């Protein structure tokens, strides 16, 4: 549907420059102490979260190799151990995952 005459640039300029059509500023921006990067007040930091996922992938890779087959999910609890930490009696009766890396500072 076309108007019976061409729409003037002046008319068009007013429509696009109306405040309703302009981009709004956001004041909910926050700083992440953990990563030192920006975050939203309702959103978690991704720089630190990225570390968790990367460690999770590495941990998951170790578990997959240890299982050695599909549909081999243990019926017993699982635990992760890093270099410098040795399985204890409390770790008995739990699947033990060994990580070549030392215990991460953030991970406890």
């Amino acid at each position: 549907a076309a108007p019976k005459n061409r729409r003037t640039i002046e008319v068009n300029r007013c429509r696009r420059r109306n405040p309703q059509k302009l981009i709004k500023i956001k004041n909910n921006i926050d700083i992440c102490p953990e990563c030192g990067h920006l975050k939203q007040k309702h959103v978690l930091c991704g720089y630190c979260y990225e570390k968790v996922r990367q460690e999770t992938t590495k941990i998951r890779q170790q578990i997959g190799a240890q299982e050695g087959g599909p549909f081999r999910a243990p019926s017993v609890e699982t635990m992760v151990l890093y270099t410098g930490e040795k399985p204890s009696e409390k770790d008995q009766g739990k699947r033990i995952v060994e990580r070549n890396i030392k215990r991460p500072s953030w991970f406890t």
Binding site: R16, K21, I25
Partner: protein, 166 residues
């Protein structure tokens, strides 16, 4: 094609005398070819006009539009050269004096339709122009008070000059 925005960045002012105030730095940066509509980029440019360097970066980081990501890269590049070449001592001491987008050369193609129709396909490109002035953004406007408006009206009445009389 014209590239005078870069030439504006090549302007060299005469050496300032010792008894002359330190000239505020002006940085002209632009991205000539962007596969984006200028109008959409203009909306981003309009909002960021007059804002500080840090404030603009924070707003862009949480913006969902593709153009905003492009602007942030352009803004980051402008800040880097401003310190590197325009002698900007403080990274935070920068504000967006000017921000605007321009049309770029497009590509022409025909848009086929499944049932024998055709259309005019166009690949849009745009230019983005920003001028950065070292220093904090200027203070915002303050609306006139009732007293200010009233005084002007009285002054206007007094300022009236009689017409076509001796």
């Amino acid at each position: 094609i014209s590239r005078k925005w870069e030439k504006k960045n090549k302007i060299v002012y005469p050496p300032q005398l010792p008894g002359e105030p330190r000239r505020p730095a002006e940085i002209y940066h632009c991205r000539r070819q962007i596969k984006y509509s200028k109008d959409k980029m203009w909306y981003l440019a309009k909002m960021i006009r007059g804002m500080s360097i840090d404030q603009a970066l924070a707003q862009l980081e949480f913006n969902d539009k593709k153009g905003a990501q492009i602007i942030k890269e352009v803004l980051l590049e402008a800040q880097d050269m401003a310190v590197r070449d325009h002698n900007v001592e403080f990274r935070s001491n920068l504000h967006i004096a000017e921000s605007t987008s321009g049309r770029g050369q497009c590509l022409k193609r025909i848009r086929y339709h499944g049932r024998g129709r055709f259309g005019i396909m166009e690949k849009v490109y745009c230019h983005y122009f920003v001028k950065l002035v070292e220093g904090p953004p200027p203070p915002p406007e303050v609306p006139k008070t009732a007293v200010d408006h009233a005084k002007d009206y009285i002054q206007q009445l007094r300022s009236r000059t009689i017409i076509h009389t001796l």
